[PDB]
Design a protein around this ligand. Structure first.
Ligand code: HEM
Length: 291
């Protein structure tokens, strides 16, 4: 397929900045969600889940079509728990009806990261809603009970190399697993609504014990009360992965730079940007605007 980005007719930077600010102000206000974690982490997960269905082989899936809006994709067992991010964004969509779905979902992830003090992520508009029949079948998102080999193979379908895989996985500093959604339970660290290199530190520094949880799935548990999925843990089992983990644990700046690039790439996979398309936008945070 060819998916050409088409800017929402007659909208510019200032228009998008207003959507960003609406999301951001609502994040600030609805702070009680999930025991005061806030909706930040769920928005990031939502942006990854709608993008992660991409298949570099036939160009199907990815963020372009905003297909998560369709029941098939929406009810993906792998998407359990995301309906919360969905409901959070509805009201915003209602306020800015001209924005495409794909653009709203992706921008939500960007906003969340920047407002949680992460790096600035350049973002491009132009995703266009596609018909319910362009909706990818379930089973394109990754399992958590696998090893490094699985992770490498998987990510290859999205065109991500080792460095990009490790950078992206640092998003696991945010939020937590919920038994009911995924069959895993617990957070990855302590500051789960602030974007930092905490994930890599925990990984290297905690004394992890393999145990079975109440869903009868294995997870690595630390005495600090943190957890790691098998796939997270696999980052220290693979020699190639481990050296990048170390770098990130050592330099947050490097991590932020790599994450930013990787995240934008993920969000733009499968989209063709004409040469006349506006360059990527860099949105200001609420704090930068004095709001
Ligand atoms: C092997 C690849 C991955 C696997 C197996 C995986 C698996 C999971 C699972 C099982 C959960 C918990 C869901 C729940 O119970 O609510 C989760 C949460 C989360 N994932 Fe990942 N994930 C992967 C990659 C990523 C990537 C690439 C990102 C973003 C860059 C990401 C961002 C998040 C965030 C922010 C949360 C917390 C959500 C919340 O608190 O609701 N994950 N992931």
């Amino acid at each position: 397929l060819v998916h050409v980005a088409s800017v929402e007719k007659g909208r510019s930077y200032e228009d998008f900045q207003k959507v960003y600010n609406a999301i951001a102000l609502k994040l600030r206000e609805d702070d009680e969600y999930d025991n005061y974690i806030g909706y930040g982490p769920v928005l990031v997960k939502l942006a990854w889940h709608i993008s992660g269905t991409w298949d570099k082989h036939d160009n199907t899936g990815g963020s372009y079509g905003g297909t998560y809006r369709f029941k098939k994709e929406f009810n993906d067992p792998s998407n359990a728990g995301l309906q919360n991010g969905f409901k959070f964004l509805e009201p915003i969509h209602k306020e800015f009806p001209w924005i495409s779905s794909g653009d709203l979902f992706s921008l939500g992830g960007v906003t969340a990261v920047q407002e949680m003090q992460g790096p600035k992520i350049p973002w491009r508009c132009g995703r266009v809603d596609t018909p319910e029949d362009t909706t990818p079948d379930n089973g394109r998102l990754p399992d958590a009970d696998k090893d490094a080999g699985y992770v490498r193979t998987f990510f290859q379908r999205l065109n991500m190399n080792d460095r990009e895989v490790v950078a992206l996985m640092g998003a696991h500093a945010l939020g937590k697993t919920h038994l009911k959604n995924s069959g895993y339970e617990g957070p990855w660290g302590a500051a789960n609504n602030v974007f930092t290199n905490e994930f890599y530190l925990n990984l290297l520094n905690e004394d992890w014990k393999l145990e079975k949880n109440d869903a009868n799935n294995e997870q690595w548990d630390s005495k600090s009360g943190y957890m790691m999925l098998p796939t997270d843990y696999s980052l220290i089992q693979d020699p190639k992965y481990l050296s990048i983990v170390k770098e990130y644990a050592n330099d947050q700046d490097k991590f932020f730079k790599d994450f930013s690039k990787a995240f934008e790439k993920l969000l733009e996979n499968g989209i063709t940007f004409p040469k006349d398309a506006p360059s990527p936008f860099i949105f200001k945070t609420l704090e930068e605007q004095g709001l």
